[PDB]
Amino acid sequence: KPIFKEVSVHDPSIIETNGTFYVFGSHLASAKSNDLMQWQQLTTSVSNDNPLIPNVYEELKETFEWAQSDTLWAADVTQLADGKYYMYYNACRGDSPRSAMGVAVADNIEGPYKNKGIFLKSGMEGTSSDGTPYDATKHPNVVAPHTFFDKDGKLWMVYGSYSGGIFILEMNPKTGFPLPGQGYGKKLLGGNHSRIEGPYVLYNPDTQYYYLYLSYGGLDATGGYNIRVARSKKPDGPYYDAEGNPMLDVRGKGGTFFDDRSIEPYGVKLMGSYTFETENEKGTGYVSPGHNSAYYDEKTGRSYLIFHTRFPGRGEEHEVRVHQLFMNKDGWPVAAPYRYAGETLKEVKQKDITGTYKLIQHGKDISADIKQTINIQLNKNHTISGEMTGTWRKTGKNTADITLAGKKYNGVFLRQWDSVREKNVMTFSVLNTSGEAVWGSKL
Numbered sequence: 001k002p003i004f005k006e007v008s009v010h011d012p013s014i015i016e017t018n019g020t021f022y023v024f025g026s027h028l029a030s031a032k033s034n035d036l037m038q039w040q041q042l043t044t045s046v047s048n049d050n051p052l053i054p055n056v057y058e059e060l061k062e063t064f065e066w067a068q069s070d071t072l073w074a075a076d077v078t079q080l081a082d083g084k085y086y087m088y089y090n091a092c093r094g095d096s097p098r099s100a101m102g103v104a105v106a107d108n109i110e111g112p113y114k115n116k117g118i119f120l121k122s123g124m125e126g127t128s129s130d131g132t133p134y135d136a137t138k139h140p141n142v143v144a145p146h147t148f149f150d151k152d153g154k155l156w157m158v159y160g161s162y163s164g165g166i167f168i169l170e171m172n173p174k175t176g177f178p179l180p181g182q183g184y185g186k187k188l189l190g191g192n193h194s195r196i197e198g199p200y201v202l203y204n205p206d207t208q209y210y211y212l213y214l215s216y217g218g219l220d221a222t223g224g225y226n227i228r229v230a231r232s233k234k235p236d237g238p239y240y241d242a243e244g245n246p247m248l249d250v251r252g253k254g255g256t257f258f259d260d261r262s263i264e265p266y267g268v269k270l271m272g273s274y275t276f277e278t279e280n281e282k283g284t285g286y287v288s289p290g291h292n293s294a295y296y297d298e299k300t301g302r303s304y305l306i307f308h309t310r311f312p313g314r315g316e317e318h319e320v321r322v323h324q325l326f327m328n329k330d331g332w333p334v335a336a337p338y339r340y341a342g343e344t345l346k347e348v349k350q351k352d353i354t355g356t357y358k359l360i361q362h363g364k365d366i367s368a369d370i371k372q373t374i375n376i377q378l379n380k381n382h383t384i385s386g387e388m389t390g391t392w393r394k395t396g397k398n399t400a401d402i403t404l405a406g407k408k409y410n411g412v413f414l415r416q417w418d419s420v421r422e423k424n425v426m427t428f429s430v431l432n433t434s435g436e437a438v439w440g441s442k443l
């Protein structure tokens with residue numbers, strides 16, 4: 001039976017290096033795994049005895065002083081062409097975008113990382129990094145980086161949280177710093193203190209798009225955190241959602257803070273809070289899944305979503321989760337309903353599809369409501385009945401083409417492992433053109 005070993009790394013940023021996977025998150029926390037199922041905790045908090053950066057309060061003194069904090073926010077580590085590992089570290093006071101971002105470099109992934117210096121600040125009283133007065137309604141909070149190479153080998157860094165939005169900078173592949181003269185870089189979306197943070201870019205060679213992953217809402221249990229995605233032919237945009245809305249249009253209304261209403265229409269929503277648990281049956285369930293990264297395995301063509309999540313009834317406790325991603329016929333990813341356990345897409349037979357399913361509809365909102373199941377039946381005659389009606393068909397090996405309440409969804413059928421009930425399950429995971437995700441789990 002599949003074996004899991006859990007770790008707690010908030011805001012996990014995945015990096016594969018020579019056969020081992022690492023996540024680096026906030027609070028200088030980290031963990032590693034060879035199989036994406038059994039993780040080993042390496043570090044958990046900022047202290048002078050954290051081995052990633054010995055004597056961290058001295059090493060990054062300037063950052064802690066600027067940000068007026070004793071911790072660090074969501075890191076990224078990326079290996080550059082020199083073979084070294086570059087940690088983009090950052091800190092924020094937490095009540096305002098009083099923040100600094102810098103880079104430290106290590107010869108080895110587990111450290112020690114040596115400070116090269118701060119290269120961005122936000123929350124100053126005067127002139128900002130772009131030469132104009134700092135204004136949090138339009139300028140970023142300089143936190144939550146993802147430094148990545150595009151398909152052509154050019155180095156970029158996307159970043160941002162709330163404040164003025166999400167930005168992208170061209171980076172120097174020799175030094176790891178931004179190329180000079182860019183200010184905060186190019187704006188991709190956001191503004192007016194929208195609850196959008198934690199950008200992450202993954203190229204998919206098969207669909208020929210860059211996917212920008214984002215977290216909407218707040219991270220806490222009542223915050224409505226959810227994982228969203230948009231895409232572009234270019235790493236620096238313009239990004240669009242499944243309806244063709246430009247992500248650049250996304251922002252809170254002028255003069256407001258945390259205007260969730262205005263932003264919820266934008267982006268494909270892959271996953272929010274849900275539970276498969278009902279009165280007479282245990283099930284998996286997450287609260288506020290988010291701040292993700294993602295990985296594409298060149299060797300197999302498979303993709304994975306890595307994130308932290310809270311859980312129904314566990315308050316603010318969080319753990320790392322990994323779900324496999326599959327691209328649908330329209331070039332959008334759908335997440336496996338259950339965490340990764342070594343499953344792969346296989347031929348699925350119609351005989352194994354028919355039956356009763358628990359259904360989760362993630363919708364398009366930012367909501368603290370934990371989405372619950374309804375029951376539907378996929379019938380032999382290709383109709384769907386029960387608490388919802390529609391139709392289903394299978395294309396090719398495992399492609400799911402499902403209509404529910406007059407909306408057409410596309411995705412996959414996949415037999416998985418349910419780690420709570422400890423049994424195999426037939427699932428589907430599908431997406432419509434409005435970016436609404438539906439998961440089915442067979443009874």
Ligand SMILES: OC[C@@H]1O[C@@H](OC[C@@H]2O[C@@H](OC[C@@H]3O[C@@H](O)[C@H](O)[C@H]3O)[C@H](O)[C@H]2O)[C@H](O)[C@H]1O
Pocket residue numbers: 094095096097136141161162163193194197218219
């Ligand atoms: O997920 C981490 C999130 O960061 C926290 O927000 C931090 C920043 O606060 C908002 O700005 C507040 C304003 O700054 C000051 O000028 C003045 O006091 C406030 O008007 C920004 O939108 C954020 O970047 C969140 O608490 C947390 O969820």
Ligand SMILES: [Cl-]
Pocket residue numbers: 284285339419
């Ligand atoms: Cl789980």
